[PDB]
Amino acid sequence: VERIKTTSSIEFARLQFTYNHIQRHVNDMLGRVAIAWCELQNHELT
Amino acid sequence: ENIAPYKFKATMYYKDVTVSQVWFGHRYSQFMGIFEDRAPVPFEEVIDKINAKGVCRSTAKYVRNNLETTAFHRDDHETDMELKPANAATRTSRGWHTTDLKYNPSRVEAFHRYGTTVNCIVEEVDARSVYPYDEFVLATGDFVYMSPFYGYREGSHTEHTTYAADRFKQVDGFYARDLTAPTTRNLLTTPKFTVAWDWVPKRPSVCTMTKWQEVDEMLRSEYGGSFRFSSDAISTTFTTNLTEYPLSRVDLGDCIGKDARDAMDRIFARRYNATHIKVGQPQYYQANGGFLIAYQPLLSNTVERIKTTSSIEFARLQFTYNHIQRHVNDMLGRVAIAWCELQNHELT
Amino acid sequence: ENIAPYKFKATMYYKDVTVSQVWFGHRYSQFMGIFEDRAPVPFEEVID
Amino acid sequence: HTTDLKYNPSRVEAFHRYGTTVNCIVEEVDARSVYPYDEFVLATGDFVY
Amino acid sequence: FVPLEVYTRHEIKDSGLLDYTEVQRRNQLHDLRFADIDTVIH
Amino acid sequence: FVPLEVYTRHEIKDSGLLDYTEVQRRNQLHDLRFADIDTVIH
């Protein structure tokens, strides 16, 4: 058995949430931009 | 939300009474009991003697355990002692005492002998009170069970006192000669001392709000049915309801108007002397977490109590996320529009 | 992690004993010691 | 409480005189304990081990 | 973002097992509550 | 970003109405200030 110590600051968790949200969205949009750029080049080869 | 107490200055007058009983052996002496007590200094003794002539009466009459008791400084006659400065020490306020050698009985044979000792003492003490300012405290640790603002004038007798009517007395036009302008003094005699402090009206003296920050420029915008007040001076975005917050609802909130108007005037003079003009009266809104925002709009030339959260990281996080969201959304909108135009353009 | 203590209600029974010794002068009176104490109230005194 | 006037001896001459006073008191008090709940405290400041 | 605290400062104040303010506020109300501080006897 | 605190820990310490440290530091300086602790009498 043991006892659990809780940190008095939650700002690590909220910071993690904010950064995760921004990272996920920016990564998604940039992936779409990269894929579109790739398709545009493969498309203008003609 | 102000949490620091209301602080002021007070003066305690009391007489340390010290009775000591001694036994006298055939080669030694031995205490067999030291009764100590803090008698209060009566009213006319504060007025006619301490404040006027800087002397104390070297005798103590007081009611203890429902009895009238009298102490004489050496069991001798009553005199007037020359109140004098006390020893010095670090981080202590000015004090004054009339004796520094506890009198003890002269040596006799096996008989026990009793020795009294009355030491008149006057100290200056910080005093503190907390909402609803029903009673206040001294740095000595003693208490006083009456509001700091109780008084005869201005209906102050509405305020809370716990002691009887006689124990409290208000003096008008008091002049305070130090013991080295007219004032009104509250004088109270609790069963341990006599506390004195300068009476002042309540509403202009306290406030349940504290000026926390001054922002030269905070942008207000409307969004989703609420106001965003965002500042880059502190990187913080508060959110408030669209309607204002009437100050009449704020308990004891009489300093808010004065402080806000003073700060806006000073900041307007310092920065917006001529480039901008005020628009309407100052407004008041309440933000998430309990922060009360006083907002004075600008233009270019061309009852209850409020609880405030102890962490502002929600607001700074909101500001950071809002800034990033706005910028990324703007840039991605531009990219999407450019991509659209490029396709419509290469159709040719 | 809970940090607020465990709070409950209790009842204290005790007798303030106050012995006072007085001296009686020819025109006045003077305390010369006030012993005070908090004696406990025994069990059957609480119950009965 | 059962009394509110501390009894004091009647006036006599120079003799010291002794006066007792017993005041029975019953109060309701909040009590608090902290882990591992080995002892607890009353709002009066007294302890119970 | 909504405000969020692991421990509100009221809790942090309360986690103290005893409190000098409260103890002194209760132990000097003793005379008023459990005795008469005014009735002088002769 | 500049440092920003709603309540500096000095204020949080100060919001306490009384203080055991300060009270004890003042109530034991009593003998030194208002009496002589050395002069023995015979």
How far is B169 from B296, CA to CA, in rounded Å?
Answer: 45
Sequence spans of domains, chain E: 1-42
**Interface contact flag, E23 D43, Cβ < 8 Å:** yes
Provide the CATH number for the domain formed by B1-4+205-308 in this structure: 2.30.29.100
Chains that touch E (3 or more CB pairs under 8 A): A, B, C, D, F
| Of B11, B15, B16, B58, the residue nearest B179 (C-alpha) | B11
Q: Are B75 and B83 within 8 A, CB to CB?
A: no
A2 near C CB under 8 A: no
Give me the torsion for CA of D28, D30, D36, D38, rounded to 10°.
-30
Tell me the two tokens of residue F10.
């000095």
Do E and B touch, 3+ Cβ pairs within 8 Å? The answer is yes
Shortest distance, CA D3 to any CA of chain E (angstroms): 7
* CA dist A26 → A13, B80, B328, B331, D12 (Å): 20, 86, 8, 11, 96
DSSP string, B25-77: -SS-EEEEEEEEEEEEP-HHIIIIIIIHHSEE-SEEEEEETTEEEEEETTSS-
How far is B331 from B337, CA to CA, in rounded Å?
Answer: 10
Do A and F touch, 3+ Cβ pairs within 8 Å? The answer is no
Provide the CATH number for the domain formed by F1-42 in this structure: 6.10.250.3280
| Of C28, C22, C20, E20, the residue nearest B114 (C-alpha) | C22
Give me the torsion for CA of B324, B329, B332, B337, rounded to 10°.
-160
SS3 B286: strand
- Residue B173 phi/psi, 5-degree rounding, is 60, 45
Q: Which long-range contacts (CB under 8 A, 24 or more apart) does F14-21 make?
A: F14/B4, F15/B3, F15/B4, F15/B5, F16/E21, F17/B5, F17/B128, F17/B129, F17/B130, F17/B137, F17/E21, F18/B128, F18/B137, F18/B141, F18/E20, F18/E21, F18/E24, F19/E20, F20/E20
**Interface contact flag, E11 C3, Cβ < 8 Å:** yes
**Interface contact flag, C16 D22, Cβ < 8 Å:** yes
Give the experimental resolution in Å.
Answer: 3.4
A6 near C CB under 8 A: yes
Tell me the two tokens of residue C5.
């203590």
Shortest distance, CA E27 to any CA of chain D (angstroms): 6
